[PDB]
Amino acid sequence: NYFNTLNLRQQLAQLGKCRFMGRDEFADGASYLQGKKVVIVLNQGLNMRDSGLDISYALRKEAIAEGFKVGTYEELIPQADLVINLTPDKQHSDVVRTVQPLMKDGAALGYSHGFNIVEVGEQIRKDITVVMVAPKCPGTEVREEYKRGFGVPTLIAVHPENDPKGEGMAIAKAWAAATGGHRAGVLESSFVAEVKSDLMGEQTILCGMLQAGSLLCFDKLVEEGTDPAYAEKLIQFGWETITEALKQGGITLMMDRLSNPAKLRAYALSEQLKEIMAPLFQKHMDDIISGEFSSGMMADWANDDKKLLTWREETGKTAFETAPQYEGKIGEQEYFDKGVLMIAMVKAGVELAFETMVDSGIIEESAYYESLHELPLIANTIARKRLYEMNVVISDTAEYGNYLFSYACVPLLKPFMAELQPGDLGKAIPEGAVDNGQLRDVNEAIRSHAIEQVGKKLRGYMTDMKRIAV
Amino acid sequence: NYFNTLNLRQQLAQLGKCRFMGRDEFADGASYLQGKKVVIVGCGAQGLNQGLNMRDSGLDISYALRKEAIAEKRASWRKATENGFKVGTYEELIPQADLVINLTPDKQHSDVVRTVQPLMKDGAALGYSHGFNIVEVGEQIRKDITVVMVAPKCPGTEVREEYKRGFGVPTLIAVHPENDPKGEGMAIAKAWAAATGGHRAGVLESSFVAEVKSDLMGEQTILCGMLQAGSLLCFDKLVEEGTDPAYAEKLIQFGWETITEALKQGGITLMMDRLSNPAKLRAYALSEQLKEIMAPLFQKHMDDIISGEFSSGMMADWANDDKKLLTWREETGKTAFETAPQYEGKIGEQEYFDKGVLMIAMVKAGVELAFETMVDSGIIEESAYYESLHELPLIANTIARKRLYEMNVVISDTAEYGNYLFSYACVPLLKPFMAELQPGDLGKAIPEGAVDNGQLRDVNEAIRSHAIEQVGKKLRGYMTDMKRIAV
Amino acid sequence: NYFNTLNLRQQLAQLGKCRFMGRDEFADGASYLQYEELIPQADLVINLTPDKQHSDVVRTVQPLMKDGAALGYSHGFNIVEVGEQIRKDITVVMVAPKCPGTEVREEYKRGFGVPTLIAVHPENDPKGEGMAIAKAWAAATGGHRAGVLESSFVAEVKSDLMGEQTILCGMLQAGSLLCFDKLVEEGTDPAYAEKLIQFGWETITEALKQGGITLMMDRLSNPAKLRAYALSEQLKEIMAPLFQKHMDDIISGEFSSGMMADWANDDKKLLTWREETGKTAFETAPQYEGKIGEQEYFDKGVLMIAMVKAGVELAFETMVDSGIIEESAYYESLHELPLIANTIARKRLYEMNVVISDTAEYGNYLFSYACVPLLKPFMAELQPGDLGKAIPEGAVDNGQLRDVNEAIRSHAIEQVGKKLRGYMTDMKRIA
Amino acid sequence: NYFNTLNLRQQLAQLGKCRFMGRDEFADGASYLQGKKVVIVGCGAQGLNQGLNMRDSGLDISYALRKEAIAEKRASWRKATENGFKVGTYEELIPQADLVINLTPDKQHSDVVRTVQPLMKDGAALGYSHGFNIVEVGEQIRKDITVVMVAPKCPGTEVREEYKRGFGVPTLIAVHPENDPKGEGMAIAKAWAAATGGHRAGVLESSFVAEVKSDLMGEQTILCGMLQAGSLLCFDKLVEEGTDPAYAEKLIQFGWETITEALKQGGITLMMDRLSNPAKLRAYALSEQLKEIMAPLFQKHMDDIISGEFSSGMMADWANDDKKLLTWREETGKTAFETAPQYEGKIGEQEYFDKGVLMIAMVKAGVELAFETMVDSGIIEESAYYESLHELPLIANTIARKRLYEMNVVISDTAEYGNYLFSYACVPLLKPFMAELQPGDLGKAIPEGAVDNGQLRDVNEAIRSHAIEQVGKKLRGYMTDMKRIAV
Numbered sequence A: 001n002y003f004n005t006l007n008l009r010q011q012l013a014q015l016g017k018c019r020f021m022g023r024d025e026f027a028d029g030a031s032y033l034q035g036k037k038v039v040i041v042l043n044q045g046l047n048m049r050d051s052g053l054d055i056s057y058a059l060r061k062e063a064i065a066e067g068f069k070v071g072t073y074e075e076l077i078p079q080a081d082l083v084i085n086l087t088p089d090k091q092h093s094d095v096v097r098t099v100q101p102l103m104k105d106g107a108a109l110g111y112s113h114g115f116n117i118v119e120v121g122e123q124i125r126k127d128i129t130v131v132m133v134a135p136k137c138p139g140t141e142v143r144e145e146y147k148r149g150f151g152v153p154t155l156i157a158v159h160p161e162n163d164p165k166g167e168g169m170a171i172a173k174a175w176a177a178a179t180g181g182h183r184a185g186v187l188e189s190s191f192v193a194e195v196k197s198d199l200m201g202e203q204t205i206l207c208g209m210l211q212a213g214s215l216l217c218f219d220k221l222v223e224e225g226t227d228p229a230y231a232e233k234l235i236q237f238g239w240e241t242i243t244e245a246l247k248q249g250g251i252t253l254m255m256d257r258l259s260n261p262a263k264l265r266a267y268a269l270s271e272q273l274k275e276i277m278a279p280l281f282q283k284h285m286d287d288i289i290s291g292e293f294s295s296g297m298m299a300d301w302a303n304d305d306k307k308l309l310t311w312r313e314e315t316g317k318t319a320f321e322t323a324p325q326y327e328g329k330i331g332e333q334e335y336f337d338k339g340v341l342m343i344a345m346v347k348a349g350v351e352l353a354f355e356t357m358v359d360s361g362i363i364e365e366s367a368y369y370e371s372l373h374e375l376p377l378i379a380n381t382i383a384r385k386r387l388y389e390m391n392v393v394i395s396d397t398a399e400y401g402n403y404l405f406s407y408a409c410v411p412l413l414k415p416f417m418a419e420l421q422p423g424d425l426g427k428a429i430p431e432g433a434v435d436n437g438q439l440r441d442v443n444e445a446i447r448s449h450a451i452e453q454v455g456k457k458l459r460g461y462m463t464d465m466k467r468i469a470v
Numbered sequence B, D: 001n002y003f004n005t006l007n008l009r010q011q012l013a014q015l016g017k018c019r020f021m022g023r024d025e026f027a028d029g030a031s032y033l034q035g036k037k038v039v040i041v042g043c044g045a046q047g048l049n050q051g052l053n054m055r056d057s058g059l060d061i062s063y064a065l066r067k068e069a070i071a072e073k074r075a076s077w078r079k080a081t082e083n084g085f086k087v088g089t090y091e092e093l094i095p096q097a098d099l100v101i102n103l104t105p106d107k108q109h110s111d112v113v114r115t116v117q118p119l120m121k122d123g124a125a126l127g128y129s130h131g132f133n134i135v136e137v138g139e140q141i142r143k144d145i146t147v148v149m150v151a152p153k154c155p156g157t158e159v160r161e162e163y164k165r166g167f168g169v170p171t172l173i174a175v176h177p178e179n180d181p182k183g184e185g186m187a188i189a190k191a192w193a194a195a196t197g198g199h200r201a202g203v204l205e206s207s208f209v210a211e212v213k214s215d216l217m218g219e220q221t222i223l224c225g226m227l228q229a230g231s232l233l234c235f236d237k238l239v240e241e242g243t244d245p246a247y248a249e250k251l252i253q254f255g256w257e258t259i260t261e262a263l264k265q266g267g268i269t270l271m272m273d274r275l276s277n278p279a280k281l282r283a284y285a286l287s288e289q290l291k292e293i294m295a296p297l298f299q300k301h302m303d304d305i306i307s308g309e310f311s312s313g314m315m316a317d318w319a320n321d322d323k324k325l326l327t328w329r330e331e332t333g334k335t336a337f338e339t340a341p342q343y344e345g346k347i348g349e350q351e352y353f354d355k356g357v358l359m360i361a362m363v364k365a366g367v368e369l370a371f372e373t374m375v376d377s378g379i380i381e382e383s384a385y386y387e388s389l390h391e392l393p394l395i396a397n398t399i400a401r402k403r404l405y406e407m408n409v410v411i412s413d414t415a416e417y418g419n420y421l422f423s424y425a426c427v428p429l430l431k432p433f434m435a436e437l438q439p440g441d442l443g444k445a446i447p448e449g450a451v452d453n454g455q456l457r458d459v460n461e462a463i464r465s466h467a468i469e470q471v472g473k474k475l476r477g478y479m480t481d482m483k484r485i486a487v
Numbered sequence C: 001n002y003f004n005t006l007n008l009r010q011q012l013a014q015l016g017k018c019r020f021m022g023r024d025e026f027a028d029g030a031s032y033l034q035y036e037e038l039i040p041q042a043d044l045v046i047n048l049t050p051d052k053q054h055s056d057v058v059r060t061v062q063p064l065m066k067d068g069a070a071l072g073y074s075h076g077f078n079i080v081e082v083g084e085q086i087r088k089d090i091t092v093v094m095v096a097p098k099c100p101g102t103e104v105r106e107e108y109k110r111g112f113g114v115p116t117l118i119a120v121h122p123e124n125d126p127k128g129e130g131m132a133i134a135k136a137w138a139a140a141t142g143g144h145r146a147g148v149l150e151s152s153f154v155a156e157v158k159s160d161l162m163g164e165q166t167i168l169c170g171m172l173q174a175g176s177l178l179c180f181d182k183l184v185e186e187g188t189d190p191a192y193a194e195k196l197i198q199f200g201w202e203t204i205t206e207a208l209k210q211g212g213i214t215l216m217m218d219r220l221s222n223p224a225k226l227r228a229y230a231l232s233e234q235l236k237e238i239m240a241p242l243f244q245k246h247m248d249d250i251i252s253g254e255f256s257s258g259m260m261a262d263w264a265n266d267d268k269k270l271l272t273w274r275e276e277t278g279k280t281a282f283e284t285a286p287q288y289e290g291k292i293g294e295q296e297y298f299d300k301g302v303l304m305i306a307m308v309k310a311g312v313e314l315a316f317e318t319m320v321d322s323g324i325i326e327e328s329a330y331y332e333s334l335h336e337l338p339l340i341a342n343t344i345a346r347k348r349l350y351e352m353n354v355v356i357s358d359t360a361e362y363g364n365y366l367f368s369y370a371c372v373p374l375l376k377p378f379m380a381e382l383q384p385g386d387l388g389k390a391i392p393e394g395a396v397d398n399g400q401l402r403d404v405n406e407a408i409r410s411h412a413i414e415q416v417g418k419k420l421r422g423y424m425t426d427m428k429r430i431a
Helices: A008-015 A043-049 A089-102 A115-120 A141-147 A168-178 A191-206 A208-223 A228-256 A260-290 A292-301 A306-316 A332-337 A340-358 A364-373 A375-393 A396-412 A436-447 A450-467 B008-015 B045-056 B067-071 B075-082 B090-096 B106-119 B158-164 B185-196 B208-223 B225-240 B245-273 B277-307 B309-318 B323-332 B349-354 B357-375 B381-390 B392-410 B413-435 B453-465 B467-484 C008-015 C029-033 C055-064 C103-110 C130-139 C153-168 C170-185 C190-218 C222-252 C254-262 C268-278 C294-299 C302-320 C326-333 C337-355 C358-380 C398-409 C412-429 D008-015 D045-058 D067-071 D075-082 D106-119 D132-136 D158-164 D185-195 D208-240 D245-273 D277-307 D309-319 D323-333 D349-354 D357-375 D381-390 D392-410 D413-429 D453-464 D467-484
Strands: A037-040 A054-057 A082-084 A108-111 A129-135 A154-158 A186-188 B018-020 B038-041 B061-065 B086-089 B099-102 B125-128 B146-152 B171-175 B203-206 C018-020 C044-046 C070-073 C091-097 C116-120 C148-151 D018-020 D038-041 D061-065 D086-089 D099-102 D125-127 D146-152 D171-175 D203-206
Touching: A008 A191, A008 B008, A008 B277, A037 A043, A043 A054, A043 A141, A043 A168, A082 A168, A089 A108, A089 A115, A089 A396, A108 A168, A115 A191, A115 A292, A129 A168, A129 A191, A154 A168, A154 A191, A168 A186, A186 A364, A191 A208, A191 A260, A191 A340, A191 A364, A191 A375, A191 A396, A208 A228, A208 A340, A208 A375, A208 A396, A228 A260, A228 A332, A228 A340, A228 A364, A228 A375, A228 A436, A228 A450, A228 C398, A260 A292, A260 A340, A260 A396, A260 A436, A260 B008, A292 A306, A292 A396, A306 A375, A306 A396, A340 A364, A340 A450, A364 A375, A364 A450, A375 A396, A436 A450, A436 C190, B008 B208, B018 B381, B038 B045, B038 B090, B045 B061, B045 B075, B045 B158, B045 B185, B061 B067, B061 B075, B061 B090, B067 B075, B067 B086, B075 B086, B086 B090, B090 B106, B099 B106, B099 B185, B106 B125, B106 B413, B125 B185, B146 B185, B146 B208, B171 B185, B171 B208, B185 B203, B203 B381, B208 B225, B208 B277, B208 B309, B208 B357, B208 B381, B208 B392, B208 B413, B225 B245, B225 B357, B225 B392, B225 B413, B245 B277, B245 B349, B245 B357, B245 B381, B245 B392, B245 B453, B245 B467, B245 D453, B277 B309, B277 B357, B277 B413, B277 B453, B309 B323, B309 B413, B323 B392, B323 B413, B349 B357, B357 B381, B357 B467, B381 B392, B381 B467, B392 B413, B453 B467, B453 D245, C008 C153, C008 D008, C008 D277, C018 C326, C029 C130, C055 C070, C070 C130, C091 C130, C091 C153, C116 C130, C116 C153, C130 C148, C148 C326, C153 C170, C153 C222, C153 C302, C153 C326, C153 C337, C153 C358, C170 C190, C170 C302, C170 C337, C170 C358, C190 C222, C190 C294, C190 C302, C190 C337, C190 C398, C190 C412, C222 C254, C222 C302, C222 C358, C222 C398, C222 D008, C254 C268, C254 C358, C268 C337, C268 C358, C302 C326, C302 C412, C326 C412, C337 C358, D008 D208, D018 D381, D038 D045, D045 D061, D045 D075, D045 D158, D045 D185, D061 D075, D067 D075, D067 D086, D075 D086, D099 D106, D099 D185, D106 D125, D106 D132, D106 D413, D125 D185, D132 D208, D132 D309, D146 D185, D146 D208, D171 D185, D171 D208, D185 D203, D203 D381, D208 D245, D208 D277, D208 D309, D208 D357, D208 D381, D208 D392, D208 D413, D245 D277, D245 D349, D245 D357, D245 D381, D245 D392, D245 D453, D245 D467, D277 D309, D277 D357, D277 D413, D277 D453, D309 D323, D309 D413, D323 D392, D323 D413, D357 D381, D357 D467, D381 D392, D381 D467, D392 D413
Parallel strands: A037 A054, A037 A082, A082 A108, A108 A129, A154 A186, B038 B061, B038 B099, B061 B086, B099 B125, B125 B146, B171 B203, C044 C070, C070 C091, C116 C148, D038 D061, D038 D099, D061 D086, D099 D125, D125 D146, D171 D203
Antiparallel strands: A129 A154, B018 B203, B146 B171, C018 C148, C091 C116, D018 D203, D146 D171
């Protein structure tokens, strides 16, 4: 909607904003927010307090009728310098359409995600400064990391249309610092870049790939013997185990945890998935860009979330979701060795998401964070309570997206599955000799990928930031 | 229209295609086209010229014209016959053609293609020099016809002059994806290109969309639009401030050529280096102020070009008997500069630089801005470089030959309309800017002297550090080697 | 000694001369160049006799050589290590193919060739046609087909001698013995242990040939790779002073002098070591009848792999630290290692020491009889999986794996290697 | 002596040590010395500077003077005490002292330590500011004594001046391997360097050998030797060609400083950039000719510095009562340039450039040739830079203050000897070159005007593509960051 009012050059200009900000740029912290009253509409407030800010949660009237000054809207919004609205996507219009009137002049509005501004096309009072601070973590590891004296990497942005006194960045950086983001790393992006990539990631590989992949591997393991109790155990904690290597060294390291002959097959499966799934990944990115996605989901918002719930149904009534969990323990290496197709699905999904985004004007640095960086964290979720936990930790917009994709992906891959060879999923592939040349050329192609190169450079930064704990 | 039926991802894909090909990729020269019947439609300048080259290259070239042209002893008809070419009618040469090269003016493209297709056999190839008919008009070519493009990077006849010197002009080639049934696009495309001599100087593998958008932006912005605007703005200023008209017109007519020659040898960096330190810094300053003022107008043109608002607009004029094109042509021809007498005496090379500080700045400003705007619209640097700097020295040569009149005559009608569309906007835009020119900006040299070391250092780096200077150095290198192989 | 008459600057000059020529510098080809009876009527002479009887040859060949004639070498040892003088009218050049055996011919017949080095002596190029002859000569051997390096007599000798007596042969011999005796000593049937060693090096270096150390290490399981890495380091740490000693004596000429002395002592040391070495268990051991899977040689040769990595790096490093060019060091501390491994698989150490020059052999022994003793305490503390058995394939520390992988492919020689191999791979594509 | 005891490999090892350290590598600063006895043997300009610096840094500093020097309150006594510095004798200070900084002239170095060691406790450290003692003389220090070094990259007293400004001077620290028992060398050296504020500009982790060998080369060539030979040669030339002696004396006295300042801001690149194009072209050509002629001489110097031929020869003179050093000093002071009257009128900044074409070229030739010759001898580009360009501006400031007299009086005797050693050979060497200068090379400006585009482009690249220019921009970039930290 708002994105669609821009032209190619203007969309591209915004679509490609994402710079890793230096440590010299945060030589102030939450300074610009010192003294000023900050009204949130926990994760962050708790952290910001320890930074020296005046946090105050403004709960709903009905809620505040049945350690911060938990007051209300009119009882806080007026003298508020920065209203950090963190309500669900489906209700931003209302919240913002009731909070603005109460907001004083020269105040700033705070967003966590840019769906309202960009997709819904919300109109904010020309004197209100609109900004955004979104930490890279599906859960609450932001507050946790804050305790360890460190923090999670975060993205900041300031809507051009609403930068009255030109103090958007000052507030943004201040807010980010208060959350500890400057400790890990802050990405100077934009509302448009954040929304398109975010939607792409979550529905295509961060959650979309993991749901379809879980319901495809489990179901397959069962069709091929395998004790469902044991199966479900592999699928539930697998993603997490292989993705932990992914977190430590990218796709490169993840592939190296396999035996050379295993790896090669994994690479082979990887390339085949990308061949099959490419069109779907594209369709998803294209619909996000054209605004066809947002438009469609919103139709469900006004239709009682029918689709969003109907899919909740089937999801909860799936073999995997409703299956016994093996009691015995499974070795770490066992999840790799037995999860060749899973590793292959990760590589293909990560690479395809990355590539599709970059082909749509999104900068690599940005695409990296939305197609690989958070993949681990979301995996940890399933490794706690199957898909259920995932579709609970993530927003409804994410879940809606995941279903939209996964319920299309699964069928698409039915034939492919019906062709798996022994060793692909379930039984391990024995280490052995392999063509020296093929091993060399394949190992190179992997670490040579655009996401492995930037992922390295980016992981290298976020590391030097953790070095500084003095 | 066609571009408009594409989504963000698809447009970007096309917009970004531009690879400098390897000399070895043309090992078969024009062989693929050997023994084939090549029919050229429209014997204009580029038409006749490409014909001569392709003939000298051993190809089978014959010109096809509307029966009326041949009947009326029209000029196109005489040009062909007087040049020992086989000239016939559409129904007489098209039916057995393997390659129909449409080199008629853009306005006529749709009509030409509408009568030539029916006569074209199955599997035959249709060639263009500009992708306007395909991208902007949306022309639908029969499914079995292969559509390709070969666009020599030169405004006039240098493509022939260079070929006679055993060399050539750098060229762009493309093959429309929707029309490559036998997958022989590139084969035909490379053959034709080599036939014109393009492989000797360098050939770029781009796309129809990338060629149309970048090419339109360049001509209506820095390649022609800026030169006209600048010539008029600068000449007038020169006279207003006292300079003798006859001497002022000489300064402008040959000024561009002299300073762009330096640009040719070494990009913006060298052009600026010809100036004295204090003069350089001022030029730098002026160009930055100029880029601030013109950025919106530059952007409007690029935006309108990307959105089809420009083609749509010009097509409106096509159907209006070229009213806007012709009225602007006539007006531009009545300008003081176009009629001003030319200085009798002589002007030294360095005088054009010293007395043309603003002209140098306009070139720098226009070049970077056009390049920048294009790259910001999804066009790849290589393309942007060729359409916002490479051909500038060539257009300047045209002006040094016969004022603006020559430029507008040499360039296509689409380029002429595009130029005017920008010119009649850019001149007013700069009125206030010109009103504040300081002494030395234009007309008089800035006394040589000391300059702050830090500033000269910072300005020298700002110059050669620019994206266009980087790419330029590289791309000029390639072309210099291809030319280097003149043995 | 010539090299010794030069000063630090003049030495670093020669020592650092080595440029990988291009496809273009070989357009003419052998076109330029197209007993006492032939000696006089000769355009160019090609002395390929052993280093010991080199001075003599020239001392009888010069007199017969016409004026403006050219003299060619294959090892500047006689020019650099031996203060050999030649007529100022004689143009001295060199063309030495980077291959020990005879693949210099086997490859030519196939169409390709062996990457060869060429150089011209400073004070011996009056007509200034050194390169003309060298390029034409080398071209006639098929060198331009694989790649020819433009180095110098000094750069050639100094690095050539360090390579053969260190990683190319010295490490191979000492490694074989140390490893064979250790296997047997730990139980392993001597007939089996014998095949492992004889053919192990060849199998291992094959990967090394295709993708340098990186690929060699990649053939091992992660846990085995990590162990091979550690063993590699420990190893370099210990052999360090020895490689340095060898490189240093080759620079100072303490080596060339020591061996030229044994030339007067009727190759005493050279033959005492040639014999003593044949009495070794490995040289005189029964060969397993059964078979050993390609992958077994890797999984059961961890310490063997470590010796190669360590040896190649340390040799490469020590050469660069003495003023030798990277690419120059690559072709003398890794490129030829595979070719020599083949020799050992063909006929144990006997074959190797027989193929390599007498100088090469002498050097090998000088290192072996020193290295072997040095590693005894090391070997004594080995662990299961390190040699003979196979470290079971399992999980490893993501971080440690990742760091080691990068540590391995980040080494200088691995960088140059990937590049140089690429060059040669494309020089071969041109056919 | 010592350096000669090492072999090719071993030499190159030490010879190639010199890496720029990270800002945070000095988090502790000089806290490793806070609470220890810091004694400084011998007091002079250099000494007092550092002491006063480490003083404010917070370190117990004392000055151990000779027996007589305390009885008749000599210069050293005065300078120290007057500043409120704790003074004493060797017998009452050296013992129970953690760090004994030997800041005395090289000529007396051996003897100084040959009396200080015995009194030094166990585990005590012996610092330096030049390794001529260690490297050039077989000075044997107690196996238990740690030998470190901290030599600031400034000939004058800016090490103290810049410290008072809250900044510092890039310093080069090192540690003799043969004397690092408790392996605390780097810990101390690092602290010492921080105590002089050196970490505020940039601290280079090098070695005793790299320092000596490079430090000596630069001073006797480009850094000083060239400046003296250049001054004399040009002054005599300017006068011989008709420039008023008083004006010529001023052109030379203040030219090196002016030209060299631009050098300080942007390396050879910016320096050349201050000249007019035709002038830049000529300076460039003169630079090449000058390097071809002086190559053997620069080489000889570097070579003798390595072979020990230099240190050997100078030490000989030490015993001969400094015969040569004094004779040359006397001769120099009688040169026309040193006694000539200084023009009273003002000379514009740009004039020093324009009329100093040859001076600029001499700096280019000398700088590159020195750098080139050092690198060709195993010295790292990083180390070659600081000793063949970084300090040139500072030495030029000296001459501008009091002709060559001041230069020679500021630099050490070893430096002065090296200078004369080179000068009195360079001057006769360039006599025939000077006889061939063309109009404009010296004393008169070369009028701006046209120049071949390609040529100017080429020269421009050649200039900024030189090795020293590369490392230069890199290093100067680092030092500028440490500088930009004015927070």
